[PDB]
Amino acid sequence: ERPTFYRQELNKTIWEVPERYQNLSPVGSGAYGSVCAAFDTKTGHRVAVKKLSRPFQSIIHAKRTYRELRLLKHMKHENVIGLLDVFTPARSLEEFNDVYLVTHLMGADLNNIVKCQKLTDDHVQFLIYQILRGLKYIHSADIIHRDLKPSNLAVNEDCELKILDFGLARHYVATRWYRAPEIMLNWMHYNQTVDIWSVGCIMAELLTGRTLFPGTDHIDQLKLILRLVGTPGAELLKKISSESARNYIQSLAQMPKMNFANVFIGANPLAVDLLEKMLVLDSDKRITAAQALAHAYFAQYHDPDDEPVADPYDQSFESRDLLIDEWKSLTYDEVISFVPPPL
C-alpha cells in the first residue's frame, strides 16, 4: 500500500511525506510538534500535517503518543476533528521514529469569528448546539476533553463547528479562564461535566462580549467564580477530597448565588436559563450534554435522531506498565491498522 515519499527541509525541520500532500507551508506551533498547511491532492481539500515532536523520548512520551493516536482514530463525528490520515516514512518497526498526523486545517477559531462580525442570538444557538452535539458523542465514550476554549473550536463560513485539541496530559491566562474550579484547584476526581462548565464560560462570553472569569490567578479566578455562583454548600464540601482545599473554602466569607438574569441583562431568557444550569458549582448537579441538547434554547436545531453517540472506547491501556519500545510498537501497530475515511 506504500506511497512514494519526498523529503524537504522547511523551517529547518525535515519533513518526509507522501506525494499526495503538496505545497507544505509552516503554520507553526511549539513543543507538541510542528505543523504545516498543505494541499491534499487525494481529496482536493486543505489539511494540517503535524510532525510529532519526539514521540518516543521517554516512557511518558511514548504513552502520550499512543494515547493521542488511539483517541484521534476513534473520533468520528461531524463536530469533532477526526484523523484524515496518519503515516511514517519508516519502512519497518526497527526504523520507526517519526509520526505524522493529518487532519482538519482550521480556517478560523471561535475568537476569529467574534473578531470579524457581531453574532446574532441565532449564531450563538447553532454554535453552542454543535459544541454540545460534539460533546454528547465524546462523553458517551467516557472521554473528557478537559480543555475547551475558543481557540480549540474551529468554525467555517457556514457556521459549522468542530472541537479540536483534546487535553491529553496525564499532566493571567486563557485556558484557566474556561476551566471548572474543581480541576483548576485539584479538588476532586472530576467528571465529564467539567466540559459543560467550559461551554458555559464560552456561551456567556459570546452573549455579552466579555470573558466571564478572567482571573489573574487561581485565587482571583475562584473569587470571581464564587461571586457569581455563591460559595460551596455542605453537600459539595464533603465531596472535596483535599483537607486543605476544604479548610480554605471554610475560611471564605459565605456568598449567595447571584441572579443570572441580573448578570446577563437583555439576553434570551432561554439562554440565561441554560447558563444557570451549566454554571453550577457542584459537578454532580450540572446539566449534561445530552440534557442540554433538549433545552428550549436549541428548539430550532435539536434533533434526537441526529445526535449520535460513539462506539465503545477501550482505555484499559492507561493502566498498562510497558517499556518505551512496547509503547512504540503499539503505536506502530496503530499506524499500520489505520483505515482512511470514505471518498
Binding site: 476569529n112 469569528i113 470579524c116 441565532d122 447553532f126 454554535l127 463560513e157 457556514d158 457556521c159
Partner: peptide, 8 residues
C-alpha cells in the same frame, strides 16, 4: 446557520 467571513 450562516455566512461568516473568516479572516479579518
Amino acid at each position: 446557520k450562516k455566512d461568516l467571513r473568516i479572516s479579518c
